Design a protein around this ligand. Structure first.
Ligand SMILES: [Cl-]
Length: 763
């Protein structure tokens, strides 16, 4: 590192024009999202050729021999792909094409039209069916393919279409249909809404249409599926079914999607992606509007992808729980009881949906507050589920490989939400986010409001702008450092950038330059004080230094060794500079408060020094007591949090996050830092406990230190997210410093500096 490999950086994105471009992107994104969150253009989703064909089957309600929705037939006739299939051209999935194409072929035949589209579709189905040698070739399956396709193929067979009904793969599908059906409770279908309502068109022989209405959605759909609803309508003539088909046609014009609406899931996927790309600070108003709406529909029974689903959806529910809690809404994890039996279920529907559900459960579980056992249990289950998912052949299908599913899953399992570097996570996500991401349900589909070029464009640009601003700040940091006198203390390693990284990688916003700078000065001072108290420097010297600390008198340093006279002078300057800035920002007297903090820190350290000089091993209690004040995280954290531009902290408000002796944010951070440090390194908490408990072994002692950490981490999360009248930026600054610390204590300190501060994203 050093002055050199820093003043050599040429921050290209520092120019005001880049930030101005970012603001145009922000404004375009707001305009793009408006219909989805405040307008009526919600649920923007691509066509389903398959569902459109089912809707096209509905005969005119006036009894004439034509479709009730002739525009759907027109759509079908006009949207066949070059290869004779129907579907999304950008993404080829066999089961999707197969299903949609046969669906379209059969409806064209019904109305005796599109004779040429029909012979091209048949050719495609027959051609592609013969490329499948075994199962490992079938690729990822759209929802309920094994059930629907054989029965569609039986329909074709009665019409005597030139399809290869005898292929082994076909027989295997019937076998798989028979095995899913065997385990189906038929009586339950009519009483309790289930996932099979999404595909009634595939089990027409089984369903008693006269009893199926008790489980119809309030909007008249069957589990939000147009195909499935169309089918029920053709058997029952039920008016609410028709109203639902009408509302979807009115909305889309001449086609239908495979799910409607998707108002809850879509809103949550937009927020999720904005948050993960690191660009959330530009969209506070939109995120609130999105989540407020989700919250309105949040209920004890969970939520589906749409607000009128008669059953909850784990994917949407787990995603909603996490985002809502993350944004300080009051949500209870008892919500996850809805997905239990007797323990959890899942692993029932189509693969990608199941994996997505467990990924979201895994992530949601990490946001646990104290005493939320159900979340510890959810984590356990999701982990096992996902570990097992990697061992499955489906995970390596051509489709999932194209999207790097296994990578995503592995990354999720090795990634702790608490032990994460926020700037680094955003940078990585900018590298994984796909503007043209395709999802799977009854057919392949996209949500353009969630996955688009603009998100990524802003994601990359905003990241680079922020980073270049930090590069300039690092120039000031290293210039200050070298004229500060601190490099003269050769018994201590120079780490100015490592400390800058610690605050900047979480508290990155441009307005908090001063907070980052002062935090960095204080951490630089501290590393020298640390090495002085525990390594360099005798007890008698330290007793003198500690006395001068009590005596805030520069003139008193005459009694100190030379190296200490200088140390005191630099220390005294830094303390009062921080204090002056804090008084400036806060409008209150704070020099007394800071002096009190520094003396507790350094008196705590002298005590540790005495213990060492005496080969004294404290009890665990007195070690903890001493260690959380002696580690000096508290005075370091105050040196940043009290100088955040525009963030006002009265004494009362400050006491809610900083109060020695209480389990508030600064105390928990101190505690977590001390103990996470001992557990990484291993005069420690381990050895203290083993003195306290002569019979206990080492691994017992360690496990006990973890038994102290895990609850502390949960308390930290609650204190952070808790609604209160403390400026959230302050609370977030304390929390993020803890998270970056937790990353540090789980040669790569430098690798993180490179990724985060040095190298830009390619544009
Ligand atoms: Cl994709």
């Amino acid at each position: 590192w050093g002055y050199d490999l820093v003043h050599s950086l040429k921050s290209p994105y520092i120019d005001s024009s880049y930030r101005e471009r970012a603001e145009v992107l922000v404004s375009e994104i707001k305009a793009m999202l408006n219909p989805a969150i405040t307008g009526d253009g919600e649920s923007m989703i691509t066509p389903s050729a398959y569902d459109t064909a089912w809707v096209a089957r509905v005969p005119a309600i006036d009894g004439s021999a034509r479709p009730q929705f002739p525009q759907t037939v027109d759509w079908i006739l006009k949207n066949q792909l070059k290869d004779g299939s129907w579907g999304i051209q950008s993404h080829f999935l066999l089961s999707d094409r197969l299903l949609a194409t046969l669906s379209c072929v059969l409806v064209l035949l019904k109305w005796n039209v599109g004779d040429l589209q029909v012979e091209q579709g048949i050719e495609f189905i027959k051609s592609n069916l013969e490329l499948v040698k075994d199962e490992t070739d079938q690729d990822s399956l759209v929802t309920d393919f094994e059930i629907i396709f054989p029965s569609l193929l039986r329909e074709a067979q009665s019409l005597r279409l030139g399809l290869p009904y005898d292929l082994p793969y076909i027989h295997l599908l019937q076998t798989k249909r028979q095995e899913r059906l065997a385990k189906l409770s038929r009586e339950e279908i009519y009483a309790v809404p289930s996932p099979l309502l999404y595909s009634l068109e595939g089990i027409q022989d089984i369903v008693e249409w006269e009893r199926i209405m008790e489980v119809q959605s309030q909007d008249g759909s069957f589990l939000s599926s147009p195909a499935s609803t169309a089918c029920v309508f053709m058997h029952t003539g039920d008016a609410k079914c028709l109203e639902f088909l009408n509302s979807v046609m009115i909305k889309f014009g001449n086609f239908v999607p495979c799910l409607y609406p998707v108002d809850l899931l879509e809103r949550l996927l937009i927020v999720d992606n904005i948050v993960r790309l690191g660009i959330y600070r530009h969209f506070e108003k939109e995120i609130k509007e999105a989540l407020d709406y989700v919250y309105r529909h949040w209920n004890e029974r969970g939520i589906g992808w749409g607000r009128l689903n008669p059953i909850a959806d784990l994917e949407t529910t787990a995603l909603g729980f996490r985002l809502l809690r993350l944004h300080r809404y009051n949500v209870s994890p008892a919500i996850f009881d809805n997905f239990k039996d007797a323990k959890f279920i899942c692993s029932t529907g189509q693969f990608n949906k199941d994996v997505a559900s467990m990924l979201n459960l895994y992530r949601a579980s990490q946001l646990a507050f104290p005493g939320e056992n159900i979340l510890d249990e959810a984590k356990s289950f999701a982990t096992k589920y996902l570990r097992e998912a990697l061992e499955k052949s489906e995970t390596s299908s051509a489709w999932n490989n194209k999207q790097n599913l296994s990578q995503e899953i592995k990354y999720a399992l090795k990634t702790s939400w608490h032990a994460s570097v926020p700037r680094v996570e955003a940078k990585r996500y900018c590298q994984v986010y796909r503007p043209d991401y395709a999802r799977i349900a009854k057919c392949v589909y996209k949500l353009p409001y969630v996955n688009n070029e603009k998100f990524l464009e802003l994601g990359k640009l905003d990241f680079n702008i922020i980073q270049s601003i930090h590069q300039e700040e690092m120039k000031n940091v290293t210039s200050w450092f070298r004229d500060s006198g601190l490099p003269l203390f050769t018994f201590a390693r120079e780490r100015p950038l490592e400390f800058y990284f610690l605050v900047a990688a979480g508290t990155y916003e441009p307005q908090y330059a001063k907070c980052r700078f002062l935090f960095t000065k204080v951490a630089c001072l501290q590393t020298v004080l640390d090495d002085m108290y525990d390594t360099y420097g005798t007890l008698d010297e330290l007793k003198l230094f500690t006395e001068a600390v009590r005596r805030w008198d520069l003139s008193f340093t005459e009694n100190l060794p030379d190296y200490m006279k200088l140390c005191y002078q630099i220390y005294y300057d830094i303390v009062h500079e921080v204090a002056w800035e804090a008084e400036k920002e806060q409008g209150r007297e704070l020099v007394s408060f800071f002096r009190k903090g520094w003396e507790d820190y350094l008196l705590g350290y002298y005590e540790e020094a005495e213990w060492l000089a005496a080969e004294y091993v404290p009890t665990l209690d007195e070690y903890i007591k001493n260690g959380i004040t002696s580690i000096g995280q508290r005075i370091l954290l105050l040196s940043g949090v009290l100088i955040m531009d525009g963030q006002l902290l009265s004494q009362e408000a400050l006491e809610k996050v900083d109060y020695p002796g209480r389990r508030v944010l600064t105390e928990l951070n101190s505690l977590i830092s001390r103990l996470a440090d001992d557990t990484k390194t291993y005069a420690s908490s381990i050895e203290c406990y083993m003195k306290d408990h002569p019979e206990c072994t080492e691994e017992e002692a360690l496990d006990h230190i973890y038994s102290i950490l895990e609850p502390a981490v949960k308390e930290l999360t609650r204190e952070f997210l808790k609604p209160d009248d403390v400026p959230f930026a302050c609370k977030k600054m304390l929390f993020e410093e803890t998270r970056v610390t937790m990353v540090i204590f789980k040669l790569e300190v430098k690798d993180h500096i490179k990724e985060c501060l040095i190298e830009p994203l390619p544009l």
